[PDB]
Predict the 3D structure of the following.
Amino acid sequence: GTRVFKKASPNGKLTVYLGKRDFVDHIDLVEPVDGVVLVRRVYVTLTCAFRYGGLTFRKDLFVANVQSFPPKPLTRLQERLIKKLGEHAYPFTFEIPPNLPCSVTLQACGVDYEVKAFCAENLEEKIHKRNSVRLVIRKVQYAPERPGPQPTAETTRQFLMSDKPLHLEASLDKEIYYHGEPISVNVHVTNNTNKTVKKIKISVRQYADICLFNTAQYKCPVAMEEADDTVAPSSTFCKVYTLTPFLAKRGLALDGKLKHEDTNLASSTLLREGANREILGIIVSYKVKVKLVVSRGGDVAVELPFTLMHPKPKDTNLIELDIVFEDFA
Amino acid sequence: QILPIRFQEHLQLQNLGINPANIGFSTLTMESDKFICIREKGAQVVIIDMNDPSNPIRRPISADSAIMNPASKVIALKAGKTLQIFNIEMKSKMKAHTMTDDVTFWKWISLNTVALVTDNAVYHWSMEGESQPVKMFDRHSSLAGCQIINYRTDAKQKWLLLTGISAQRVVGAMQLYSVDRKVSQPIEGHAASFAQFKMEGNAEESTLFCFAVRGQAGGKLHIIEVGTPPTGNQPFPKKAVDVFFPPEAQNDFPVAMQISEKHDVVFLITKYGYIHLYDLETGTCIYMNRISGETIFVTAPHEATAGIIGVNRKGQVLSVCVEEENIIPYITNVLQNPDLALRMAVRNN
């Protein structure tokens, strides 16, 4: 049975229905925001804003207005629900430009997407939080896995008084990871020195830059493992370690309010070449750090950038062919 | 500086989560700019609706080929000699047929007819009713042993054009069949298209047949009228122009052709991913450029812009069309051909 999310205004006069709350960005386009409102004209608006702070700064990034009543093809969902609901049911559709930032919150500021349905004569008129309805939807970023070589980093240290190298190489099993997906780290040490590696520490760190109003750069670990694996003088070490970055912490970028079950760590910001890195508001990225903790010597580390994405949505006949309501809450 | 075309990348199929292995001539079809259809094998088809490419439908199949209707939510499927046509809307099997001979190539040639090519013959099969395939003509011996790469018809379906290729240099062999005369002719060509074109002062449209080839004389484009000029018509003077290729593109040859009747221009695509524009009337070359680093291996008319759309081996969906605000000044100033520019401005606006 197909789920459809609904929400009514306070006075029970307008209800909005949506198939979904999160709309996947597929880089060349975003899933369309295909809804129905069950009903002065009736307007429906989609707004994207950055907010900082209660509030102390706001920048509008995108607005789209639809007149829904009175009246590109309807989705099966719209038709299905129009028939299954009446003739007071009207379609609205937005297409979100793919270059707008995805939903992101850092604890405070963020980028949010709000759908607003209201009844009113012109577009420039007094909105009454009484017969209007407001829904926070999300844009979440997908990207496909990359063909070809994985991520790879290496470093060489010579310690005081010596010219023998401690060499570290690491790579990741992928360039593109999805929420909940484990990261495998291949670690290769050649220790030609007379120091001993006492342990190995692997972390996943997020970096989040605030780019508007009050700029700032946060860092914050989202996975940490240490192993008491030792690398003796004149010995090599190869081992694969596995870490998964997990939400289950101030300064952390999330895609969502920390209070909701369906919130994840923020996805990596995909940046177009010379795009306005200011109307994105928050830039998020991720690295794996591999560190050799050296006895009687400074530690030796590499970092391996990676991208964290939201996952993509889940008899003779030569082909095979073949609706419940929920609160938006 | 301004260009006589607009080129666009509409999307990359892998961004939709499509497996790049499934992106090629045998697993991917696009019979019109409305759908892309992909067979993904643990079998099924992914139908991408280009009005809404975000919400692809996935269905299980056991077909070795699937070709979406150009216009409607209707899909033809085959498994060996077994052909079936399905209405996705009404979820019903419309029609089925079992061929005597294997169908080695097929495509929709309008809104409601499939062309079927066997080792032996070419058939048209309506999607409607209970009518069986109608044999249109026997295959000519000069396509014997070719890979069949296309099948074209004119607007009245009175002229039918089967195209195959073989490794020998890649030789192009066409068979042009006249439905009224019931006669085939062999033509050496690699890509072709028909068009309607009405000459100045003529009573009726001419049916034009345009074909491009890279043969013993190198690259050539021919434009001819097929059939006897209508009462009230002058004949269309045959045109023949060179199709240029690089020094770097010694092994390149034409692979696709679409004609815009809105602008009377021929779009030609080469294996290496070059696009050319030619004037339909004179064959004059208007533009050439490499637009893709991979073969564009499937093309269709791009209806909204009257251009050409296609898919390349890396999953990029690309199109080209006339840029109507630049084409005349481009022909005037960049090509310095003010006679062509005025003629096209007047002919089409």
